[PDB]
Subunit: 228 residues, 3 copies
């Protein structure tokens, strides 16, 4: 299948490119701006990791992030899956964006921590781009941190701790009934100076791990942490 | 329990009939039109198969489809469960409709294909009826196709391929943040001539199977394909 | 972690207190009323049992229920998880509320009945308090019953039977596409005299157990029934 670019067991994430999408279909897609060439990154488990991976693909190419959608998923876990549509005019440039996103999954899963009772997710970049902006509300060109815990109360405490660690600016706070697809996540997003943003993410991680462990299992990442 | 009609392991689907529903309850239900007699079809796994099954029940009776509701479910898969309420004036007719729907499950699951990573669902009819109209936006009395893939990006490619196969008319495209219960499905619905519709659905199936297989498992239907 | 109060394996429920929440965060929380001190009760499986357990924490303390939020969860089952935020002036009062809620989970899971196909949930109190009000629409100071079945069509029948058992007043009926987080639950809430309310909850339980058991498995509670 010419549309197939690659598929990864990480999050059950598949990447595809439609070189010239049918106009009647395009007309029904909820995109910020229409383009003839579309890349598609679609996964069962994760939204932050795939969104941050796609941000590297946008930085590497001329593609634009035109839709981020939010399945309530993770195959029985508390989180989201994800659908990301990017738009451009060159199928080659789309394929390269999708390949770069797929080759960043092992990194952006590095601070996802899982346990039987729930999970934590952390993300950080010193310079957000268009996927982080559309998907997570990041301010493009500026530092960005994502601090998430499930069950969602843990995220509320992670958020409080992170804000009290350095003078970072809160962007939003999403929760089961506001700004998620009824996930069981409490997620603070932040901006500010890159060092402080990193400080605040790491503080939220530490208290998240302590809280989630209280169910009796050390939360585990399947790939090495990238936030340090 | 007089209200029980039957239960199937297929989708964990249960059918019941309330011959004369309490009016205080009926004023709390979101129905297109109130009737005193309700048929209820309720499942954990599947929305399209039950909807198309109930379409046969409507064709077979005088019952009207008055509500289709959408649990996000499939017991940890990426799809929907379903609540279908039908209404009429005769408890026996409501029961016959529910029986006909239960008896069509093995058929309407025939183009549901499952794998660890996801699933595909295809439906087709040459003449849609009231449940397909209310539930899925079909045009009654005309041909209808549903072409769905999970994770949802597979469904976007399935749909592009379907439209490029024959001149069909798209009805809608639903996706995780538009027109689903935050499901992981991308679903194209179409009408047009019955032959062109069947062509489009079959080509969507083919590319979806190829795409979903890339996770390393052949997608399996548990019942013979009907399309 | 000073914020930690307790964690239970019942529902995967964790209880925490923030003595002095950051004001920038509080401004982003969806609460009915700002308080400096927050108690947080959060779980993967259950909403009604945590809300009813928090009602007893409220009755025991000066805390007010200021937010109830609704994960679609139960770890692949058909129900909700829950996030409950309580607010007050005194971190010790918040801790006592959370402890009382945690110590009520074994009781409020008493009439939660699970099976492979679905589950039932019943609740009862002769006097609802603020968590049952904000969370479930109960009338404060009056008896309250909750009658819920999954898959959701079982809840419609349970609710019909309940109303026809005694003269009770329906407050709401929530369903997959109305008033839930796309759960697969049909849930009737009622008020009225306490004896009539218990009669109705119990009759709803009986018919639900019979219907859910048609899938082949007796629905089981993990804790003694309290109703």
């Amino acid at each position: 299948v010419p549309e197939f670019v690659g598929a990864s067991e990480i999050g059950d994430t598949i990447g595809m490119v439609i070189p010239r999408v049918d106009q009647q279909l395009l007309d029904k897609l909820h995109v910020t701006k229409q383009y003839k060439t579309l890349g598609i990154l679609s996964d069962r488990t994760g939204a932050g990791p795939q969104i941050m991976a796609m941000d590297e693909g946008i930085k590497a190419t001329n593609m634009e992030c035109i839709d981020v959608e939010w399945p309530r998923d993770t195959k029985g876990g508390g989180g989201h899956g994800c659908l990301i549509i990017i738009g451009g005019d060159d199928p080659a440039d789309a394929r390269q964006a999708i390949r770069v996103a797929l080759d960043n999954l092992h990194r952006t899963f590095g601070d996802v921590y899982n346990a039987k009772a729930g999970h934590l997710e952390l993300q950080f970049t010193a310079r957000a781009a268009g996927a982080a902006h559309l998907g997570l509300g990041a301010v493009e060109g500026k530092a960005f941190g994502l601090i998430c815990g499930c069950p969602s109360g843990i995220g509320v405490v992670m958020g409080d701790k992170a804000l009290k660690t350095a003078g970072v600016e809160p962007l939003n706070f999403t929760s089961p009934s506001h700004g998620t697809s009824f996930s069981n996540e409490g997620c603070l997003t932040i901006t500010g100076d890159s060092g402080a943003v990193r400080q605040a993410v790491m503080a939220g991680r530490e208290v998240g791990l302590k809280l989630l462990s209280q169910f009796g299992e050390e939360p585990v990442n399947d790939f090495p942490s990238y936030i340090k």
